[PDB]
Amino acid sequence: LPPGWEKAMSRSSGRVYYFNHITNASQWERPSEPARVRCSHLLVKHSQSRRPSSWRQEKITRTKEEALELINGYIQKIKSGEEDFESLASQFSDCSSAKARGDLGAFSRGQMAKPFEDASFALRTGEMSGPVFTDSGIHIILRTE
Ligand SMILES: Cc1[nH]c(-c2cccc(Cl)c2)nc1C(=O)O
């Protein structure tokens, strides 16, 4: 199985699934290193972010755990096809990258916060992370190239 990926048992269903401890991705389907990758992300900041401020809201008051709830909801809507990643990022990301549908451009190792970087580099093109925690807040990351 590729980097980060492990088999787990579903506690609701009893079926095996796969989890990635690097990107916090999880899926039923069995899965599945570049010098640069290109990603977009959606950031939900909280009261404990390094700067609890954004273009959406001057003073970010939500708790870390309320932020995780928002992230989980967005992942649901992306996975169900109810909303697409780009649209939720444009509307709801606390990163200024929201204005470019969450697109950050290409980057190499040594540039991003390590949890983000490691998540980005362990995704394959087209793959989406689960909740990824950094000092900025909580991200969902989409590897586009
Ligand atoms: C507004 C913003 N974006 C990011 C960011 C953007 C891309 C990757 C990572 Cl790790 C963090 N941090 C912030 C912040 O204000 O802390």
From Swiss-Prot:
SUPFAM superfamilies: FKBP-like, WW domain. Phosphorylation at Ser-53 by DAPK1 results in inhibition of its catalytic activity, nuclear localization, and its ability to induce centrosome amplification, chromosome instability and cell transformation. Ser-53 is dephosphorylated upon IL33-stimulation of dendritic cells. Keywords: Acetylation, Cell cycle, Cytoplasm, Isomerase, Nucleus, Phosphoprotein, Rotamase. The modification Phosphoserine is found at residues 53, 90. It comes from the Eukaryota. Its EC number is 5.2.1.8. The keyword RNA-binding does not apply. This is Peptidyl-prolyl cis-trans isomerase NIMA-interacting 1.
